[PDB]
Design a protein around this ligand. Structure first.
Ligand SMILES: Nc1ncnc2c1ncn2[C@@H]1O[C@H](COP(=O)(O)OP(=O)(O)O)[C@@H](O)[C@H]1O
Ligand SMILES: Nc1ncnc2c1ncn2[C@@H]1O[C@H](COP(=O)(O)OP(=O)(O)O)[C@@H](O)[C@H]1O
Ligand SMILES: Nc1ncnc2c1ncn2[C@@H]1O[C@H](COP(=O)(O)OP(=O)(O)O)[C@@H](O)[C@H]1O
Ligand code: BEF
Ligand code: BEF
Ligand code: BEF
Ligand code: BEF
Ligand code: BEF
Ligand code: BEF
Ligand SMILES: [Mg+2]
Ligand SMILES: [Mg+2]
Ligand SMILES: [Mg+2]
Lengths: 513, 104, 539, 44, 96, 100, 535
């Protein structure tokens, strides 16, 4: 052998085409999932589940892609979700028509890639300054002005029907985790049936465990709470202890030490005047007797992550060592403990001071369509958390994108030379969002892009498309405004993308290691 | 360095003499019992036809049985020759033919 | 090139042999095979490749040695150039692609002298002569030197971050210039990879923020611990021993004979740890960084004491935090007497210990070290393929800066070190004479491959630049003492005209061209000495 | 096919074509690397 | 290239012979002679083999000419005795 | 050269056209060298070997220019005149032997 | 820069022997071929027993035969088969030594090539050396042209004697030789000095001993007499001194035309006129012969049943169905002429014989027709007999070799002396001029002569004497004396004098047995690039 054989080399313009081809035909599978008139691409996963949504990244995420340029494209909607939450659809459509409007028109006119990258790198530094100057800063704590945010960002996927409730559930979830937040202290326990109008953010945590002993109370008024990082049975010697019995009596004395060890725990647990005791590990069948006589309803084996969630609500701190259980570690101001029964299965609630973790109870019409709502609420809770960090808002609905078009269409003419061709094709690219927004609506794109581009030049930044109508609309008067970081990152990575794939001129296949 | 084609056999001097002798002596030692008054007959049988023959005529034995050993096939012919040129002495020819080569 | 016949006299097993001309050629063909893959990837106008794992999983890069590493090479005399390609990346850091293409043309040309009639011993003596003269010439055409911002930026172009070269220029320079250290009682070298590089997929490429401290890719082990501690003079405990419960030391067994000792012995398995935890808390430690484990038992002790404490962190990281904050690594603390004590002076002083949220991932930052400057780079960008390469593109660019700082000499690159050697050596060819002449002559012209392919890769014509470049370098040998005033050198490829690469700012390090050729020779020498190959089949 | 600056020939060819303009069309070689040729004179 | 996989590039003759895969038992005897020269001198492992190849070629022609190999062998070893004597008389000593 | 053809036909020769014909050249670009030698046997008889030799070495010494960014159109526009000048060199060099 | 390519067609099935390591594999190939035969040279030679793919047995000494049978594969060996095959045609004898010399020459070349010498210079060195050997032989060779009639007939026997003593025919080589000479005198036109081997027929019938192999002055047929009642002997009518033969090429059958035909008989009486034409057309055939005065009818095509009995009644012994070639031989031995149609038979176109007799060829087998003469006739049938199919064939193959050495002596009436002598003089003569050649060729000439010495050495070898001894006694006795006709006493008499010993080889024989070797040797040396396809 010379190299290794069984190696398909694609070189030159030949290799270039393969990348732009795939990257643009990636946008194609999601083009009809943009905006309001968008659809639901129902997906069959590998091992037998089902996913059917709009959430761009959740569609791609469940597609297997082989051609590296599309493997690079799909794993690029991942960066977007892992930063903002919404805009995972947009990113890929731009990533495509930056490579589409830009590349073939000008790579097949002999222009060298490395000039194009420098040309498209300037078009971003320019594009970001445009978005930030066409946006308007917003009051993050005008509780009702922030609901207009969320109202707009859910007005896309099947959840619209009940936006009013969802925004209250989204905004009230982020309100009680704010010093700045992390939306993973927010368990979203999905419970099938009822209807959405039954969903209620609980300032607290919900558990699927029942009280370990029948006699223990299923209703405590104001429970003092202890949280445990340790099992409630006798531990063994971590030093491989073994017992060698000689005398007759020896047996009972030891076999009670374990009976006593638990009573030494229970005496130490109960010594903090508790009424509730929750453990990460399992609870003994003798531990329940001494905690019944202690008057404490006990909960066993509860998720490690659910403990940090509870300890944040109740205010108590979790301790591994029973020996050193202090006065601080008890649940001051948890207003209630109940075990209500939601048709067959027992759930334990913890309701009512200073919260910093929260449980979203969701109700729908199936365990299947519930997930598709959670996919909408996660995209809702995201647009609310963005804004509290980056207080500014872009005027969306194609308007922010068209703004970047004629600002870059002016800058290109004023640049001239050779660097102009690639630069005048990011301006070409931006209009693709309006273009698909007219399309998904169903109006004539050319007729409406015309009355959009020119009606933007001397007609304000906030001039975009109304989804359901398919007409030009001043987005100030309408109420579609997308958070500023979405428009920022969307344009950021989508170009960072097109400028990674352009550097490719050669594809060597069959590499190994 | 091989010279000939495949499935070709080269029995040289030392080994060629072995074939020559072993072949003749084998044929001689086959008809030895045919010779003489108180001599005995052979029962030849072909695989083809299901036919046979109970014979003494040394030629009829040798002319019948198949053989590979060239040195043997030589004495086989000299047996036919004798049957052609005299009619009798088929066995005598072959035995004396072999015994000379045995003594060689 | 008809497949050869196995001899009818010799008898070799699971092995055949090709001799004289058949081998010499097969070596050059396989050498060109390896070299020609990565010629496209040479120069600022050079491009990048996409290397499919076979599962579809891939890596995109320029860095020659990583491309060569990745290609499955089957021939001995291919893997030799690949073994050199990396021997480059461990002795210079950059120039990996160049050194391979030089070695190839040295072989190729050397062979075309043997494929004429000239003996290999003549040529190998004729390569020895040229190299002795080229390095002597390089040192007499080196410039000993602001300047670091160029040497960085020269290793930026040809790779992805060359479009944002100026940023990733001052990144590289400051990052390194802030880990200066002395060894062996005076050696002032800048540590080979002390700048801990992390890459997270988010934000923009320009928004990759240098850390004025150190980047740990770990989190505050317990969620109830403070995810920040700020203000001047913060105390950090760099640990190495685990904080868990022990199995009876080692050779220790348990025979319980008096039942009451069950709980006595079991409880004391907690103590030893809780006692070592206490000797840490009570030392005035606010932040703990332990290489080995932390028990849930010993977390609840940090939690309540508001000690932000990490577990299972790379010891490679912790020693560079030991050398930077003031701290000393604690393998295990036993005094002059047997007693296990922990003095407060063991800890490192810093500014802040902040766990910072980057694109769906939190990690701890040790801000503002006191005992010595420390620097870390957190890259940001499109996806993982994007980040991967710009980390490898940094490792190449941080490298060329290191060797500048380690060796007080730079060369005017841009292929003018090469171009100048072409005509100097070609003119030196007459000084010897005979058959040894064509050898040096082929060597002098075998250096053309760098300046040639740089301009091929631009798609446009090469010879226009190439030969007109030679004339300018042929204008330095007929140039008088005072009349210098004729001396100039360099090449530009974006605009495509000959430019002064010292004034332009194109700078490759001194060693990067010496240990470049030095190796390239002992490559083709070994291959040219090959006249018979004997390949024996697996066990 | 001639290996000339596509981006530098086409603008130089259009410019010279805006009645002696009617004859101007592209040519091969180094002097014509400047641009075009008067096609009326080369018998083309 | 080793049976095992390792690449070996050499000029040392014993190192060359040991690592190629010689199959013919009599040919393998040659490796032993080349090994024995290394274990008596470390140099001349190439010289010693070529000599056997030209001495054997000698022996061949003599066998062509019909000389009993026992005589050849003994007189070839009588050729050794007289030759090593010559080298011992022709050599110029060295100050140690 | 001793060539044994696919049909057991054993031939020995020095005649270039005969060697290149008995060699089955499949490569379509290397079939030019068989037709280049065949034409020499048709018009002359001798040279058959030399023509191919010349042909190859022209393509061989054109590789170093092609390795650099040079158009093949310009290379052969320089060979086309060179041969037309090589013929002019011979015509003035050819000795009319009836005279001397 | 690596593409898996297709230059030549079916490239995967083409192996290439290259440079020196190829030449070794070529010479050693010829070497092995030589070792097979070298033991079969001279009167002390031994025979090779080859078997055909079908299973037919051959036992021979004729070198050409030996090599012709063996299924060979190595291209150099294949070439040597044709080398011996060549000699047999050009001469008939020598086929054995031709190959030995060629291999020894190729050996000598191998020894010199490993000394770093260009092979084309060696081949050119050989040919200039071969042209010096043949010149010394032409200068020294003895001549039978200046002889009387009594001595010429003796030298031809001496050559026959030499050619035969080597093969199992050696038993009766007094008889066998005296056949080979008798055959050539009879058949070759003196002034044309040209002998046709289409004139001498080889016939072989198995039976009795090789002693019983006679030469018959006429022809022997595998045909009987047409009618069983006909007599065996045919005696010449007293006053004629000959038998007379009706040699015919027409059937004793009612004449029928060549072009397609048919009758169209309507009248019954006209079918009767046809019926009485059948019998009459027959009687007009027998009267036609009886009136020509012939005693025996020999005809090419077959006799009709009615025509056979009327051939008996009128005392006309007949030979049904005679071969085309065989009729030609009858008409030439009997002096007669060949007669197309009955109308053309005349008492002048009759064949004169001394006897015609149906011999009981076998004791039980079949009868044969011998047409003999007491006078010398242009065709002569050579009837070989033996005790075995394999002896018969080899005896025929021994006569044909013996017959050839006499045919060569009629063409070139000059002789040289064998037993190595001829090879020795050449070796000596080339040897002395090697020092006078000098330069590069000094080794090539030395080679040529030294390789020649293998012929006498391998004679002395097979015969059981020391190779160096016989060589150093022989080459030396050919310098101390002026004589160049000193050889080896392979049989084992006191002298080395090949003259007095009657070991005689023709001249052209020896010369061709050198030129063919050196020329082919040049061809192998010229080869260095080898390309072999697949099977
Ligand atoms: N009712 C509407 N009419 C027109 N444009 C809209 C409307 N709602 C949202 N948009 C625009 O479309 C985008 C939302 O579309 P969506 O399918 O959610 O894409 P993504 O998942 O990328 O956010 C917003 O960024 C906004 O600019
Ligand atoms: N801006 C530039 N102008 C001209 N030449 C350059 C420029 N940047 C780099 N080079 C040249 O190209 C070479 C860089 O090679 P590169 O393709 O990065 O791979 P490697 O460094 O591994 O050989 C350097 O030797 C340098 O001489
Ligand atoms: N009676 C003899 N005495 C000495 N030499 C002989 C005698 N007969 C033949 N020779 C030699 O031996 C050779 C006979 O070999 P032979 O087996 O007949 O094969 P070829 O066909 O080569 O003659 C001749 O070259 C001749 O010189
Ligand atoms: F369809 Be999306 F990512 F709101
Ligand atoms: F065996 Be026999 F022919 F009397
Ligand atoms: F392609 Be390199 F290692 F700058
Ligand atoms: F090749 Be050696 F043993 F110096
Ligand atoms: F090889 Be040639 F046809 F003179
Ligand atoms: F063996 Be030979 F052809 F007289
Ligand atoms: Mg570089
Ligand atoms: Mg010629
Ligand atoms: Mg003879």
């Amino acid at each position: 052998v010379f190299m290794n054989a069984s190696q398909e080399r694609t070189t030159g313009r030949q290799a270039q085409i393969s990348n732009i081809t795939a990257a643009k035909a990636v946008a194609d599978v999601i083009r009809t999932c943009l905006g309001p008139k968008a659809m639901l691409k129902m997906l069959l996963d590998p091992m037998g589940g089902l996913v059917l949504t709009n959430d761009g990244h959740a569609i791609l995420r469940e597609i297997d892609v082989a051609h590296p340029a599309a493997k690079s494209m799909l794993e690029l909607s991942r960066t977007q979700d892992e930063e903002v939450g919404d805009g995972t659809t947009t990113v890929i459509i731009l990533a495509g028509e930056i490579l589409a409007q830009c590349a073939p028109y000008l790579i097949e006119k002999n222009i060298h890639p490395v000039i194009i990258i420098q040309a498209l790198k300037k078009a971003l530094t320019d594009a970001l300054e445009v978005i930030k100057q066409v946006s308007k800063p917003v009051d993050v704590e005008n509780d009702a002005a922030m609901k207009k945010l969320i109202q707009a960002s859910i007005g896309t996927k099947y959840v619209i029907h009940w936006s009013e409730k969802m925004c209250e559930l989204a905004l009230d979830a982020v309100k009680t985790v704010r010093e700045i937040d992390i939306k993973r202290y927010v368990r979203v326990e999905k419970i099938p049936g009822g209807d959405v109008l039954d969903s209620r953010v609980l300032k607290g945590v919900l558990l699927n465990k029942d009280v370990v002993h029948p006699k223990m109370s299923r209703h405590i008024e104001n429970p003092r709470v202890v949280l445990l990082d340790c099992p409630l049975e006798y531990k063994k010697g971590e030093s491989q202890t073994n017992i060698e019995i000689e005398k007759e009596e020896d047996w009972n004395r030891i076999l009670q030490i374990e009976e006593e060890q638990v009573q030494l725990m229970c005496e130490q647990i109960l010594a903090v005047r508790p009424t509730l005791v929750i453990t990460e590990k399992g609870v003994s069948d003798l531990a329940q007797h001494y905690l019944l006589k202690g008057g404490c309803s006990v909960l066993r084996r509860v998720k490690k992550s659910d403990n940090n969630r509870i300890a944040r609500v109740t205010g108590a701190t979790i301790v591994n060592r029973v020996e050193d259980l202090k006065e601080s570690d008890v649940g001051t101001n948890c207003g209630l403990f109940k075990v209500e029964m939601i048709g067959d299965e027992y759930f334990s609630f913890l309701d009512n001071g200073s919260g910093k973790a929260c449980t979203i109870m969701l109700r729908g019409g199936s365990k299947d369509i519930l997930n598709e709502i959670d996919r909408n609420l996660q995209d809702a809770m995201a647009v609310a958390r963005n804004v509290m960090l980056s207080p500014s808002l872009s005027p969306g609905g194609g308007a922010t994108e068209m703004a970047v078009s004629v600002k870059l269409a002016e800058k290109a003419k004023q640049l001239e030379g050779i660097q102009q061709w690639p630069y005048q094709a990011v301006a070409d690219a931006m209009e693709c969002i309006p273009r698909t927004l007219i399309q998904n609506a169903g109006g004539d794109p050319i007729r409406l892009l015309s009355q959009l581009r020119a009606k933007h030049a001397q007609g304000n930044f906030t001039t975009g498309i109304d989804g359901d109508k398919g007409k030009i609309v001043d987005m100030v008067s309408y109420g579609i405004w997308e958070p500023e970081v979405i428009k920022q990152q969307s344009v950021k990575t989508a170009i960072e993308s097109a400028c990674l794939l352009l550097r490719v001129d050669d594809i060597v296949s069959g590499v190994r290691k | 360095v091989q010279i000939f084609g495949d499935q070709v056999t080269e029995e040289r001097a030392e080994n060629a003499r072995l074939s020559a002798f072993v072949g003749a002596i084998a044929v001689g030692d086959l008809v030895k019992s045919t010779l003489g008054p108180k001599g005995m007959d052979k029962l030849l049988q072909s695989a083809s036809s299901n036919t046979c023959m109970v014979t003494n005529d040394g030629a009829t034995i040798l002319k019948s049985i198949p053989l590979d050993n060239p040195a043997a096939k030589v004495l086989v012919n000299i047996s036919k020759v004798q049957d052609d040129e005299v009619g009798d002495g088929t066995t005598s020819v072959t035995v004396l033919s072999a015994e000379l080569l045995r003594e060689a | 090139q008809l497949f050869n016949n196995s001899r009818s006299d010799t008898l070799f097993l699971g092995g055949e042999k090709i001799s004289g001309d058949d081998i010499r050629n097969q070596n050059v063909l396989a050498t060109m095979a390896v070299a020609n893959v990565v010629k496209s990837s040479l120069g600022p106008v050079g491009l990048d490749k996409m290397l499919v794992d076979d599962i579809g999983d891939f890596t995109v890069t320029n860095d020659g040695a990583t491309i060569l590493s990745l290609l499955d090479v089957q021939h001995p005399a291919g893997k030799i150039l690949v073994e050199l390609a990396q021997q480059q990346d461990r002795e210079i850091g950059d120039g990996t692609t160049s050194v391979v293409i030089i070695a190839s043309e040295l072989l190729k040309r050397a062979n075309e002298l043997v494929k004429n009639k000239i003996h290999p011993t003549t040529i190998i003596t004729g390569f020895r002569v040229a190299l002795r003269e080229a390095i002597r010439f390089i040192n007499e055409v080196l410039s000993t030197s602001e300047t670091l911002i160029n040497i960085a930026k020269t290793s930026m172009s040809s790779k992805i971050i060359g479009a944002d070269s100026d940023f990733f220029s001052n990144m590289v320079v400051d990052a390194l210039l802030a880990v200066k250290t002395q060894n062996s009682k005076g050696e002032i070298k800048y540590p080979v990879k002390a700048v801990n590089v992390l890459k997270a997929h988010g934000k923009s490429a320009t928004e990759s923020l240098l850390v004025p401290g150190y980047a740990l890719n770990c989190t505050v082990a317990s969620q109830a611990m403070p995810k920040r501690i700020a203000g001047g003079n913060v105390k950090i405990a760099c640990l190495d021993l685990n904080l868990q419960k022990a199995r009876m030391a080692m050779g220790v067994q348990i025979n319980i004979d008096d039942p009451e000792q069950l709980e006595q012995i079991r409880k004391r398995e907690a103590g030893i740890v809780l006692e070592r935890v206490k000797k840490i808390i009570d030392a005035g430690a606010q932040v703990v960084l332990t290489t080995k484990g932390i028990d849930d038992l010993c977390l609840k002790e940090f939690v309540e004491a508001k000690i932000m404490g990490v577990r299972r962190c790379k010891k490679e990281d912790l020693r560079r935090i030991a050398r930077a904050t003031g701290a000393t690594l604690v393998s295990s603390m036993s005094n002059l007497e047997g007693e296990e004590t922990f003095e407060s002076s063991y800890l490192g002083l810093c500014d802040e210990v902040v766990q910072a949220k980057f694109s769906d991932d939190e990690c701890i930052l040790i801000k503002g070290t006191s005992k010595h400057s420390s620097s870390s780079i957190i890259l940001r960008g499109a996806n993982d393929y994007s980040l991967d390469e710009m980390e490898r593109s940094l490792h190449d660019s941080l490298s060329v800066v290191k060797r500048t700082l380690e060796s007080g000499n730079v060369v005017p690159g841009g292929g003018c070190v090469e171009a100048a050697l072409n005509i100097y050596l070609d003119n030196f060819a007459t000084t010897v004479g005979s058959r040894e002449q064509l050898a040096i002559a082929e060597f002098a012209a075998a250096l053309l491959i760098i300046p040639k392919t740089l301009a091929v890769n631009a798609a446009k014509d090469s010879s226009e630049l190439v030969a007109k470049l030679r004339s300018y370098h042929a204008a330095s040998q007929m140039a008088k003492p005072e009349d210098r005033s004729y001396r100039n050198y360099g090449l530009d490829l974006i605009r495509g005209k000959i430019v002064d690469e010292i004034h332009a700012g194109v700078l490759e390090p001194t060693i990067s061209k010496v240990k470049s050729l030095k190796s390239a020779l002992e490559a083709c020498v070994a291959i040219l000495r090959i006249d018979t190959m004997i390949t024996v089949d697996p066990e | 096919t001639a290996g000339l600056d596509v981006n530098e020939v086409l603008p130089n060819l259009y410019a010279a074509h805006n009645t002696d303009h009617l004859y101007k069309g592209v040519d091969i070689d180094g002097e014509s690397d400047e641009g075009v040729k008067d096609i009326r004179e080369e018998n083309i | 290239k080793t049976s095992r996989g390792e690449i070996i590039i050499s000029n040392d003759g014993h190192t060359i012979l040991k690592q190629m895969a010689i199959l013919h038992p009599v040919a393998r005897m040659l490796v032993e002679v080349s090994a024995a020269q290394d274990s008596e001198a470390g140099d001349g492992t190439t010289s010693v083999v070529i000599l056997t190849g030209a001495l054997l070629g000698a022996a061949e022609r003599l066998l062509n000419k019909g000389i009993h190999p026992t005589i050849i062998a003994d007189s070839f070893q009588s050729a050794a005795k007289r030759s090593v004597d010559i080298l011992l008389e022709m050599c110029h000593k060295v100050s140690l | 050269i001793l060539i044994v053809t696919s049909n057991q036909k054993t031939t020995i020769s020095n005649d270039g056209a005969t060697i290149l014909k008995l060699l089955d050249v499949v490569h379509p670009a290397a079939k030019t060298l068989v037709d280049i030698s065949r034409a020499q046997d048709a018009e002359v008889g001798d040279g058959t070997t030399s023509v191919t030799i010349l042909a190859g070495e022209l393509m061989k010494e054109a590789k170093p220019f092609l390795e650099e960014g040079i158009s093949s159109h310009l290379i052969m526009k320089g060979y086309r005149k060179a041969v037309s000048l090589a013929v002019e060199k011979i015509n003035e060099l050819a000795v009319d032997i009836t005279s001397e | 820069m690596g593409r898996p390519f297709i230059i030549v067609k079916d490239q995967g099935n083409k192996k290439r022997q290259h440079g020196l390591e190829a030449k070794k594999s070529h010479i050693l190939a010829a070497r092995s071929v030589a070792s097979i035969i070298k033991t079969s040279l001279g009167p002390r030679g031994l025979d090779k027993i080859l078997i055909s793919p079908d299973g037919e047995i051959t036992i021979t000494n004729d070198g050409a035969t030996i090599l012709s049978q063996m299924e060979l594969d190595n291209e150099i060996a294949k070439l040597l088969v044709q080398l011996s095959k060549s000699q047999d045609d050009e001469i008939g004898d020598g086929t054995t030594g031709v190959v030995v010399l060629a291999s020894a020459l190729l050996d000598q070349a191998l020894e010199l090539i490993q000394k770093g010498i260009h092979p084309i210079k060696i081949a050119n060195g050989f040919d200039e050396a071969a042209k010096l050997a043949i010149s010394k032989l032409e200068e020294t060779c003895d001549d039978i042209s200046a002889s009387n009639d009594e001595l010429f007939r003796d030298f031809l026997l001496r050559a026959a004697k030499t050619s035969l003593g080597s093969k199992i025919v050696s038993k009766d080589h007094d008889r066998f030789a005296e056949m080979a000479v008798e055959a050539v005198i009879n058949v070759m036109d003196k002034d044309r000095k040209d002998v046709d081997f289409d004139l001498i027929k080889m016939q072989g019938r198995v039976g009795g001993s090789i002693s019983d192999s006679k030469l018959i002055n006429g022809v022997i047929l595998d045909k009987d007499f047409s009618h069983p009642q006909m007599p065996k002997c045919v005696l010449p009518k007293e006053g004629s001194d000959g038998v007379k033969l009706a040699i015919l090429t027409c059937p004793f059958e009612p004449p029928k035309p060549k072009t397609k035909h048919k009758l169209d008989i309507s009248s019954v009486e006209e079918y009767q006129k046809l019926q009485t034409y059948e019998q009459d057309k027959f009687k007009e055939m027998i009267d036609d012969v009886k009136k020509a005065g012939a005693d025996v009818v020999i005809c090419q095509w077959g006799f009709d049943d009615e025509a056979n009995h009327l051939l008996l009644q009128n005392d006309l012994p007949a030979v049904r169905w005679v071969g085309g070639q065989e009729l030609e031989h009858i008409a030439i031995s009997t002096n007669g002429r060949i007669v197309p149609r009955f109308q053309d038979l005349s008492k002048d176109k009759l064949g004169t014989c001394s006897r015609i007799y149906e011999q009981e060829f076998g004791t039980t087998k079949d009868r044969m027709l011998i047409i003999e003469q007491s006078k010398e006739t242009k065709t002569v049938t050579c009837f070989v007999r033996g005790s075995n199919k394999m002896i018969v064939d080899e005896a025929e193959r021994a006569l044909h070799d013996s017959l050839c050495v006499v045919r060569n002596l009629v063409k070139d009436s000059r002789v040289v002396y064998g037993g190595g002598a001829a090879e020795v003089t050449m070796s000596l003569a080339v040897s002395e001029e090697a020092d006078k050649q000098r330069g590069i060729d000094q080794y090539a000439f030395r080679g040529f002569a030294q390789a020649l010495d293998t012929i006498p050495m391998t004679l002395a070898e097979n015969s059981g004497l020391d190779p160096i001894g016989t060589l150093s006694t022989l080459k030396s006795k050919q310098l101390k004396e002026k004589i160049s006709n000193i050889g080896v006493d392979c049989l084992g008499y006191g002298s080395n004098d090949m003259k007095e010993l009657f070991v005689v080889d023709p001249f052209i024989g020896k010369k061709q047995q050198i030129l063919l070797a050196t020329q082919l040797c040049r061809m192998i040396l010229k080869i260095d690039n080898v390309i072999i396809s697949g099977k």
